[PDB]
Amino acid sequence: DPIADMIDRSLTALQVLPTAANTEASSHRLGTGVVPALQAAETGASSNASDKNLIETRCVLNHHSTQETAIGNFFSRAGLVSIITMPNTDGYVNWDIDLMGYAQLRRKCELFTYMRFDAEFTFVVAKPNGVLVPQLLQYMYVPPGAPKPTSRDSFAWQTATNPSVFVKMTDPPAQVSVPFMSPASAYQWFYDGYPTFGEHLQANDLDYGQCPNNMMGTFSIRTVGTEKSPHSITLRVYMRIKHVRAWIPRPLRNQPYLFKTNPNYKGNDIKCTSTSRDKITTL
Amino acid sequence: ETGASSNASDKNLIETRCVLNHHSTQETAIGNFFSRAGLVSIITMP
Amino acid sequence: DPIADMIDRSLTALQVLPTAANTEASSHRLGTGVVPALQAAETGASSNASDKNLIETRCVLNHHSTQETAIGNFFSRAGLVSIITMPNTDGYVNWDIDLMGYAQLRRKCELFTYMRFDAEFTFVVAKPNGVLVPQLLQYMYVPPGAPKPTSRDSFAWQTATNPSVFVKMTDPPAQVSVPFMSPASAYQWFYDGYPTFGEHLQANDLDYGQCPNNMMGTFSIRTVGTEKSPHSITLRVYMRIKHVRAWIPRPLRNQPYLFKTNPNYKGNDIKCTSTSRDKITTL
Amino acid sequence: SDRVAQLTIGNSTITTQEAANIVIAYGEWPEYCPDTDATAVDKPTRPDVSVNRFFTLDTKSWAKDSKGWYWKFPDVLTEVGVFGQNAQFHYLYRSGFCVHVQCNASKFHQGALLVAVLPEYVLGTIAGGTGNENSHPPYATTQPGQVGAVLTHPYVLDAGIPLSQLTVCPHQWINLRTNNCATIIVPYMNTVPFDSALNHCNFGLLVIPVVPLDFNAGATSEIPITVTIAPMCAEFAGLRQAVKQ
Amino acid sequence: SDRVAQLTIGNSTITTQEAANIVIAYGEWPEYCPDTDATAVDKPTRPDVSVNRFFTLDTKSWAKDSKGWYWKFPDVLTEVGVFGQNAQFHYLYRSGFCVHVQCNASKFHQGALLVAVLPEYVLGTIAGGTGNENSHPPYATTQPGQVGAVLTHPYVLDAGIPLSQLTVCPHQWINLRTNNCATIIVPYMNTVPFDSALNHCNFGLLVIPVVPLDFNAGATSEIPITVTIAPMCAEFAGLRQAVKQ
Ligand SMILES: CCCCCCCCCCCCC/C=C/[C@H](O)[C@H](N)CO
């Protein structure tokens, strides 16, 4: 050892809690020095005063389960993400995969920062007035980089490699399972920065917040036949979320959304978070 | 010239650290590469 | 060991050689492959061919000692370094300590780069024609930073701290011993660079090559009395070198010196290193 | 006996006599990247003294009607020191941080500051006022550098989320009657083990005055705020010539 | 079987097929400074990847009547790379070196180069021609940078010592009929364990053509020379703001 210079802690570990914690009995107390009612919120720690340190309590054994508050049961519900119509007029549509088009699922997923999950997609398809007509349809998923079909009878519809479903209108709705497919370790709904290098100007200002680890290609449907079908079609896509793991919670949004790609809000009507009242003394 | 490919790795040219990777080679097998239904014929009865 | 990356030779050692190496006997040799006569000087190593590998030799036990070639015996000889005269006219001189004023000792010390030694100084003093007159003298060594005497009767001559010798002209010559006193670990006779920071210009170009680890202050002599002595004095200083250690040899200088502080030479008469002859075939 | 504190790292030392406790964000210390999570093959470089030290940014002025300020990390340190040089000559970095905010006043003033570290702070616009424009923030707003920018609508944090529940992030308070400093230790939080320092900004630091500063006339009406930060376990990889942005 | 060689350090690799052996100057490997010889008390910094790599300087042109060139160390590397930054932000450095000179020609040319490393190469003037002027070399001559300067009187090496005994220093030959490269490994040689990099220059590297380059007309008359160097065990201490010179 010629150089004496070169030779040279987690805080809390998790545990299972099936039920809510019980309440133990207590009595009155008269003493000096010990005080649980006085805290200091300046340190950023929340208070640890229970019920028994302020009043006298009895003994209550509660068996209230905390199962419904887990993240698995909170997210595993199918929600609407897309409405796709074929009046587009040539019997096919190419829809870019973006799951931020409807505000009810966007608010729940933006509660966390990083998320890692597997999905399950379901397609419910009918006419624009709910009417049913026997008709053959084809769905095709196109990964990013793959060629896309430009016509109703292109060579991309041969599906030699692409996953695809053939389903009729009179059938039960189709269901598929999709694994976690990002190049990174988790999806993120917020990306503070620019994706590319080089100079950032007013022509390239729309790049701010677009992370390529979330762009998953496109999605294409068509009527199967080579001619023009005489019916209008409308597709609704529902997505469930399975095997959820989340990280780094955030405040929830209280302003209404404006676009799918940026958190811009309306600058004139800033909505106050609570409903206002008249006086501070009268409820 | 001998028709053999080179056997030089990364560690023989630069200095490297230790990296344990768990990247699977399942998708590159010939069974998963070919077991996908593709179109072979269009037959019409006018 | 969470990181497997963080956990992670001298060539020849010296030996004593009192005498020169002997010569062992040999015979003729006829063979292929083995060849000591062919070398390659391109690698920068000198050849290792002895006498016995080229001709046939007898056995010779020699007892030639290598004592005179040691660095201790090569340097421990007193040489002249200074001539100091008092015609200056006020009975005192202040001479700055610089040991590069006479070329015979400058050539020997510039053979090595770094040197570390203790000295021994001797002062031989007489009139400018060798005549002797009874007279009292005082030598005083002034370290760098100390005040210097400006007159024959200044307050610096009280020598409350300074080392000093009082000696007469009729006496045997004085002798002192001086230890190794540099701030660095060894004296150096070459310093490639500037001593100070900041901008280097044509006004500060004379700083190049002046290392402050070799400036050792000044040296002052005087006649003791408060009046004007009627005799001219001449001092000669001789320095021996003891306990020598040297490092990193150099080529020797073949051009005559010009100044005490820089290796400048005359640019018109560049002296050829060897004495020239007429023809290459006739010695 | 815990009101005094001293933090030393590198060749710098911060002392305080009226201090709150130390906040470790999500209870994790910053550390070097282990081999099980690494993906780069090149051997990383660790300067480990010249970048693990306290760097002091500029000083803002707290008025009686101030809105609030924000700094983007590690954009604040990318042009200063040797950390400004290693982040210009490399492609990947990875480091924790340690934020320390000082603001002191006498016993006759009053006010309250809410300091908070917020990861992935994506800013937005007011969308042209009426809400029909797809506006975007310019480069001077999103990455201000070591100066820092002010807030316009602090009630919505210029990102559509309300101030009222910002304390779910790691945070502290600077109440002018008890203490004068706040300190947070942040580990490295990202989906990838290394990232670029010129195109990605990990978190934002927000200093918002909840209770306004008030005093009687005659006191020192100049209340400054000074932020001091320090990287913890900085590593770098992927050497290439200098590119500033 | 020893005519081929490969040197790798950092993220760089030098290969040669007609090479002489490797010269270790005075038989000592470069190493970090031990505690018995240290005098500074601050903990040193070791970048240890970003500065221990091969750096390539510019390329000179060997003509039929060239004199010779010299480079001062480590003045050649003080404005390039991260080693150019750590030598500007610190007060003390300490490092070894590894010099590699390439010059290649065909089997129909002839010539011989003498490479040599000379420590404490103090230049001089011609003292005004007649020898009465106390002239001094300017700053552009003594520290040329990464370009390097040419010699004027190579027989006396512009320092008063003859060329005829320059081989007492560590040295090699580049003879155009056998090899095409030369390589020396130099340890750190100074009286003090650390030194400034902007006011001190340790050694000089000299490339002097002893035998002139000769060929028949029609061959490639453009013979270049390229020097490549690499620090070995670089340490730094004493951090201060950037001062270039
Ligand atoms: C036959 C199956 C076809 C269905 C293919 C679905 C694969 C695409 C799944 C994407 C998983 C979510 C990825 C990113 C979601 C959001 O759109 C982005 N974060 C937008 O910010």
Ligand SMILES: CCCCCCCCCCCCC/C=C/[C@H](O)[C@H](N)CO
């Ligand atoms: C009473 C004793 C008085 C004598 C005092 C002698 C002390 C000075 C000894 C100096 C030792 C050599 C130091 C440097 C020598 C050369 O002058 C410099 N290297 C000039 O380059």
